[PDB]
């Protein structure tokens, strides 16, 4: 099985153009050129995770008054998966029991209660943040951005060599990088530590704008930029700080 690892530097996400997909850029070592080159991997199927805090006792949603029966976990599961599912058009969700702690400002929340963990693909619509239920007290994780989910779940701590298993090559290019890769699920990528950062390319640029003579519009006339292809990120700043430049 082919696997490659690369030093990721930045990740890009959009909730409208490509919802549920996180693009992740960085430097990948290439043996053919025995160097490091730009690379971009897109991770799909980042499933929204929501936590339903259930009420200890069912209360009418119309008025909040007592109903007459306790609340069990299976009860809230059924209530959600029927009525909330139909209301907000969700066809597939993996509801599970979980036990999570809460110690923050949201009023009236048990510290260590039980929760219903609903994990469903981001393609389906997101529920409103103020959703209230007949059985469930209130839901958290409604609008947690996919990038945060990927970062927390995968235990990624800043730029660190990430190794991806089962890299599928997408048919059409999606970025300007030299190498591209695919990841069906966020769990397919793991974090490897015992490696040193690779040198990167640094370009320092400066340009001269000028207000248009007629009426208050900036106009760029001159550009200059210095380049350093192999810039160390742990050693001392290379001297000279550049090896090429261009102006126009």
């Amino acid at each position: 099985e082919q696997v490659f690892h690369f030093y990721w530097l930045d990740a890009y996400e959009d909730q409208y153009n490509q919802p549920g997909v996180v693009f992740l850029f960085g430097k990948v070592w290439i043996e053919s050129a025995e160097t490091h080159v730009s690379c971009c991997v897109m991770v799909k199927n980042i499933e929204r995770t929501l936590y339903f805090l259930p009420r200890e006792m069912k209360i009418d949603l119309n008025t909040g008054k007592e109903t007459g029966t306790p609340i069990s976990m299976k009860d809230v599961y059924e209530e959600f998966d029927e009525k909330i599912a139909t209301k907000y058009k969700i066809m597939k969700f993996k509801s599970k029991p979980v036990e999570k702690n809460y110690a923050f400002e949201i009023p009236d929340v048990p510290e260590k209660s039980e929760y219903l963990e609903v994990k469903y693909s981001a393609e389906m619509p997101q529920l409103p943040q103020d959703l209230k239920g007949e059985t469930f007290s209130h839901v958290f994780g409604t609008n947690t951005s996919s990038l945060e989910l990927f970062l927390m779940n995968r235990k990624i701590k800043g730029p660190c060599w990430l190794e991806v298993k089962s890299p599928q090559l997408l048919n059409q290019p999606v970025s300007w990088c030299k190498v591209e890769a695919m990841a069906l699920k966020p769990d397919l990528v793991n974090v490897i530590k015992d490696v040193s950062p690779p040198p990167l390319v640094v370009m320092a640029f400066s340009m001269k704008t000028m207000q248009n003579a007629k009426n208050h519009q900036n106009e760029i006339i001159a550009m200059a930029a210095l380049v350093h292809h192999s810039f160390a990120l742990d050693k001392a700043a290379p001297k000279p700080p550049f090896q090429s430049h261009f102006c126009v």
Binding site: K100, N101, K155
Partner: protein, 251 residues
């Protein structure tokens, strides 16, 4: 891109997630479109003046009094009972402090590659910056973890300890001319540089033994200073050279 809040909030998110918490949902409105000060004794001081950097004061407060989201009982709050086990926020603040200390120890030992020495210095500086910005992460309206009672309590305790330090150093036969939670200018009435250094060391030691986790230090020395306002002064910065000699840089 700027903003310590982002990095510190992500640190808190990692800490909570690794500890199995339900971190507060990211604010929906979002759209971020962006203590006590001692009245200064303005005047001319021809005697040596020394600066005590009150950096990492708020982190030290949090460590000392175990202020956390999991400890303080908000509903102005009340100090948590000391017997309670250390909270989360004090936990990783302590982790940062201990790793800074170990990096400092690594720096102490000699016979190290100068590049490695620079790397250790950079790591120590980064740890110091993160520790300093921890509180800013805690108390700020735009932040994810905005906890008004906790910020109010931390500021109150900081002001209390600063006032106590001022009165104590006054009792030490010295006089303090300015300080706001990040620096303290002390007039030594001493014309001997070594005497000033040892006096600064003694005041630092006594404040440290009064407050265990407070890490004060000497930032700079002014041979003569004209004070007019915050960041409004004219001084002869005392840059210490070798053999105890110093240069009076004009600042």
């Amino acid at each position: 891109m700027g903003g310590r809040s982002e990095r510190n909030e992500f640190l808190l998110l990692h800490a909570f997630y690794e500890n199995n918490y339900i971190v507060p949902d990211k604010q929906i409105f979002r759209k971020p479109q962006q203590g006590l000060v001692l009245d200064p004794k303005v005047g001319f001081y021809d005697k040596f003046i020394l600066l005590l950097d009150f950096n990492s004061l708020y982190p030290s407060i949090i460590q000392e009094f175990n202020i956390c989201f999991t400890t303080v009982q908000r509903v102005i709050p009340e100090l948590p009972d000391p017997s309670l086990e250390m909270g989360i926020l004090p936990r990783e603040i302590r982790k940062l402090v201990e790793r800074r200390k170990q990096v400092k120890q690594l720096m102490k030992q000699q016979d190290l590659n100068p590049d490695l020495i620079l790397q250790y210095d950079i790591r120590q500086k980064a740890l110091k910056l993160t520790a300093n910005s921890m509180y800013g992460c805690l108390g700020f309206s735009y932040s994810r973890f905005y906890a008004k009672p906790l910020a109010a309590l931390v500021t109150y305790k900081g002001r209390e300890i600063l006032m106590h330090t001022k009165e104590m150093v006054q009792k030490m036969n010295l006089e303090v001319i300015y300080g706001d939670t990040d620096s303290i200018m002390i007039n030594t009435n001493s014309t001997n540089l070594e005497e000033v250094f040892k006096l600064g060391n003694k005041v630092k030691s006594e404040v440290n033994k009064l407050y265990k986790l407070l890490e004060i230090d000497i930032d700079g020395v002014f041979k003569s200073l004209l004070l007019l306002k915050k960041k409004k002064y004219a001084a002869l910065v005392v840059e210490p050279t070798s053999d105890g000699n110093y240069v009076t840089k004009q600042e």
